[PDB]
Amino acid sequence: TLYSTGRPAGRFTLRPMHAALIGCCNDQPVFLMEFYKASEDDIGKFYAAQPGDYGMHLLIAPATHPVQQFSWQVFSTVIDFMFSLPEVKRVVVEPDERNTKIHRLNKRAGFCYQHTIDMGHKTAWLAFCQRENYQQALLKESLNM
Amino acid sequence: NSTLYSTGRPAGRFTLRPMHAALIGCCNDQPVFLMEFYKASEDDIGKFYAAQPGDYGMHLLIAPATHPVQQFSWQVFSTVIDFMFSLPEVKRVVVEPDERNTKIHRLNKRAGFCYQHTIDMGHKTAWLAFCQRENYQQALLKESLN
Secondary structure: OOEEEEEOOEEEEEEEOOOEEEEEEOOEEEEEEEEEEHHHOHHHHOOOOOOOEEEEEEEEOOOOOOOOOHHHHHHHHHHHHHHHOOOOOEEEEOOEOOOHHHHHHHHHOOOEEEEEEEOOOOEEEEEEEOHHHHHHHHHHHHOOO | OOOOEEEEEOOEEEEEEEOOOEEEEEEOOEEEEEEEEEEHHHOHHHHHOOOOOOEEEEEEEEOOOOOOOOOHHHHHHHHHHHHHHOOOOOOEEEEOOEOOOHHHHHHHHHOOOEEEEEEEOOOOEEEEEEEOHHHHHHHHHHHHOO
16 A cells, blocks of 8 residues: 545545555545556647656546545545655646536646647546645645635 | 434434434444433433433443544534434433543533533542533534634
8 A cells, every 4th residue: 555644534545456546445445546657648649748747547436325525535635645756746637528527626626727639539628736736725625715 | 224313424424223222323334333312310310410301311432443534523422412402302411421531521512511510420420411402503503614
């Protein structure tokens, strides 16, 4: 197990299925995360991918036990992990423009949306996050407004 | 089906089912606490004050934390109180904590319990303390703010 932290729902951890990580709450698996370097992935074809650019895909299993704010706790765990690695300079994501739930999460974490791209299988938004705006969003979250 | 009460909290879905005088408490279908639930008039406590019609008390025991979860005691405690106040026969909650049990006193106070006086019950020195809906509801408003 690579990483752990505490949230309201319980203790979140990450263990390798490094490029595909299983995520658990209280030792129960509840999400999959794919973790890639931007340079070597499809997304690297649509912009000038830099050294330090990493992306992620995230899948959250359906909720038998429906727990408030669970998506935000997963998402923020994932980002906190990526930013715990000093080689990760910037997080790049390519959410499908229709996937409204992931855009809410992205924006809450300080992601900046650049422009849409057509990747053939989907139209995506290209969006970035660095530590500065992420840490500021964490401060927003702790101020409870 | 055997569930008498359920409510949602940050840690998950909380439920109560019979083990009604002994109830088991679960979070996301995992048992995590025992509550004994008695009418004050008929209990050892009734011998130390003028127990009224409407007076109910209880005892709460919380299992060891396999996974420690933020604010869990308060979510359990508060579920227990919300449950007691969901019963229209319960006019007043009466508690008799040991004067040394500092953890339960924080919980009681945070839910708007008013401490009356100490009582030597033989096996312990306890505080007698009451809660009615008015001050509990106000404590719930406090929690929902910050």
